[PDB]
From a paper:
Azoreductases are a related but previously thought to be distinct group of NAD(P)H dependent flavoenzymes that have been identified in a number of species from bacteria, to mammals. In order to help understand the mechanism of quinone reduction by azoreductases the structures of [name] bound to two quinone substrates (UQ1 and AQN) have been solved via X-ray crystallography. We have shown the azoreductase family are very active NAD(P)H quinone oxidoreductases with broad specificity profiles and as a result they may play an important role in detoxifying the quinones secreted by many of the host organisms of [name]. [name] has a preference for benzoquinones e.g. Bzq.
The structure of [name] bound to AQN was solved at a resolution of 1.8 Å with final Rfree and Rwork values of 18.5% and 16.2% respectively, while UQ1 was solved at 2.0 Å with final Rfree and Rwork values of 23.6% and 18.5% respectively. In both structures, the quinone is only observed binding to one of the two active sites, although positive difference density is observed in the alternate active sites there was insufficient to unambiguously build in the model. In the structure of [name] binding to AQN, AQN makes hydrophobic contacts with Phe60, Phe100, Phe120, Tyr131 and Phe173. AQN also forms π-π stacking interactions with the central ring of FMN while the sulphonate group points into a water filled channel. Neither quinone oxygen is in a position to form a hydrogen bond with Asn99 upon reduction as has been previously observed most probably due to the bulky nature of AQN. The binding orientations of UQ1 and AQN differ significantly, with UQ1 binding parallel to the ring system of FMN while AQN binds at almost a 90° angle to FMN. These differing binding orientations correspond to those observed when methyl red binds to either the wild type enzyme in the case of AQN and the Y131F mutant in the case of UQ1. In the case of AQN one would expect the δ+ carbon, which accepts the hydride, to be the carbon attached to the negatively charged sulphate. However the sulphate of AQN is not easily accommodated within the primarily hydrophobic active site of [name]. As a result an unmodified carbon atom accepts the proton in a less favourable reaction possibly contributing to the lower rate of reduction observed of AQN by all azoreductases compared to other quinones.
Numbering used by the authors:
A (entry chain A): 2 to 126, 129 to 190, 193 to 212
B (entry chain B): 2 to 123, 130 to 186, 196 to 210
Amino acid sequence: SRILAVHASPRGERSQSRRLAEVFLAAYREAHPQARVARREVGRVPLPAVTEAFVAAAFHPQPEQRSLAMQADLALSDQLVGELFDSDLLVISTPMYNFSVPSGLKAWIDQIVRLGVTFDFVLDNAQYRPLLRGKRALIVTSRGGHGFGPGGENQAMNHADPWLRTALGFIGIDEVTVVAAEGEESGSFEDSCDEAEQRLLALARSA
Amino acid sequence: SRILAVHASPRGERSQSRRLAEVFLAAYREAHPQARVARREVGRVPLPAVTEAFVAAAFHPQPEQRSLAMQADLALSDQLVGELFDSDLLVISTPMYNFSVPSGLKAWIDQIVRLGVTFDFVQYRPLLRGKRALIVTSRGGHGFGPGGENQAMNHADPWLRTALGFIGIDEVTVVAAEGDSCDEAEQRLLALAR
Ligand SMILES: Cc1cc2nc3c(=O)[nH]c(=O)nc-3n(C[C@H](O)[C@H](O)[C@H](O)COP(=O)(O)O)c2cc1C
Ligand SMILES: Cc1cc2nc3c(=O)[nH]c(=O)nc-3n(C[C@H](O)[C@H](O)[C@H](O)COP(=O)(O)O)c2cc1C
Ligand SMILES: O=C1c2ccccc2C(=O)c2cc(S(=O)(=O)O)ccc21
């Protein structure tokens, strides 16, 4: 089995989303000594935004005719997509930043949603089709505040993990589990972290 | 009379969101000859993401004691916030990219939501007053607007409303072109500009 872990917090040792995700990965490895884990850093590394050159290349009507310069514009995207194609399970760790995700993780999504590679379309009278099959995802997220989850007072303000679900679903990753810790700013954060940890150990050991 | 225009499409001449917003701006200037427009590019220029250094500086409990290095970490943020302070009307142009906004615009928001500057806590409260915003957005698909089949999937302009509302900008208008709609948007913008 093959895991791709995408870490989105810019924090290091102090990132709770990174820490929780790494609890999961360690527990998974304990149960699956032969599994391979690849990490793609998008929080502590600036992941480039989509440019006009990326757009021209990624939507070129005859992709085989792309110049070597166009291929250079897509080289990073190709690498990021390949990582996902090589994986069975995608783990994304992310803070909530201003009701969404850190910009680096948005840039990652923007590199991996690719016409003819992770989705396609046909024209009837465009009808989109996902191209990733057989994958699952786990989103591990930390939030300073409270009530962003289902039934929460602030649920409507959450454009972080629900948005990720939609973006991933578009390319075919429909089986998505979310594990959230809340209260990081106040610090019953211990309880929320403890609950997230236990949930992640159960998930790792059953996978 | 003072406008801050934040353009988020990485495309230049070819950008429809940029073009529609510039139609608005030109019409607004004609109607208000004294207006000033500041342009802050976040689509064609790589605006840095929040770093752990940013977080340490921005959430410093005693900001008057920030070192010169920490102030450097916030210098771009201060400039971006300052542009917003100086404006009466914020115009944001943006495509929808993968059900949200291009990453540069997320980066811009992450720089301008600032503890003790654009919001505070006691409960979080907004600190900007007297501003309004116009979001001009373009989408390749359809049904992402109010009452649309895909409304629940729109994490672009509804998310911008939430973030902008948190810092105190709650008079927000959205003009969207989807898929004709552009011509409808263009006519809506000319009317708004007058
Ligand atoms: C730039 C920034 C924006 C944030 N925005 C939110 C937010 O919108 N809602 C929230 O509950 N917490 C917010 N927080 C608090 C973080 O979500 C929380 O500290 C989280 O645990 C950080 O993830 P990490 O520990 O993996 O770095 C924000 C923190 C920062 C630094
Ligand atoms: C990377 C990328 C992602 C896109 N994602 C979406 C999307 O999620 N939904 C949609 O309706 N259109 C999507 N589109 C189509 C654009 O929103 C549309 O072409 C838009 O008008 C571009 O704005 P612009 O002309 O100002 O650059 C996407 C286009 C690109 C290049
Ligand atoms: O609806 C679209 C969409 C939906 C969900 C994810 C991505 C896209 C997209 O890239 C797109 C592009 C274009 S294009 O004009 O750039 O080809 C049109 C529509 C869409």
